[PDB]
Design an enzyme around this catalytic site. Sequence first.
Site, short mmCIF file in Angstrom:
data_model
loop_
_atom_site.label_atom_id
_atom_site.label_comp_id
_atom_site.label_asym_id
_atom_site.label_seq_id
_atom_site.Cartn_x
_atom_site.Cartn_y
_atom_site.Cartn_z
N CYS A 111 0.46 -4.17 -0.32
CA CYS A 111 0.64 -4.18 -1.78
C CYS A 111 0.07 -5.44 -2.43
CB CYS A 111 2.13 -4.04 -2.13
SG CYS A 111 2.87 -2.45 -1.71
N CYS A 113 6.11 -5.26 1.08
CA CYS A 113 4.91 -4.50 1.38
C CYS A 113 3.66 -5.39 1.40
CB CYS A 113 4.76 -3.39 0.34
SG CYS A 113 3.21 -2.48 0.32
#
Length: 108
Positions: free
Chosen positions: A35, A32
Amino acid sequence: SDKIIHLTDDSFDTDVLKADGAILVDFWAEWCGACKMIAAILDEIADEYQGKLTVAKLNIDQNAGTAAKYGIRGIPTLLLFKNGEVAATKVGALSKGQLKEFLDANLA
Ligand SMILES: [Cu+2]
């Protein structure tokens, strides 16, 4: 990362559900991209908000049970818990300033 609680399926109950006060849980994974910025902001938040807020991380690849229990659909997702119950959620990237006002929005 020194101020971030590392959560798993097996520590979630004790560290979050039985924890007094506010815990901000970051649902994330290594794949991700968004993230990564979340992580840097969270280090600053954890530091600035010490004694008022605990910040934690739950890797969804490694703890799919917890991810499923809380209906996580995409990451990053932030779940704010207060006294063991979900108080608020925020799905997707946001700025440090936005995170601060999201936190303020949840004050008693
Ligand atoms: Cu740290």
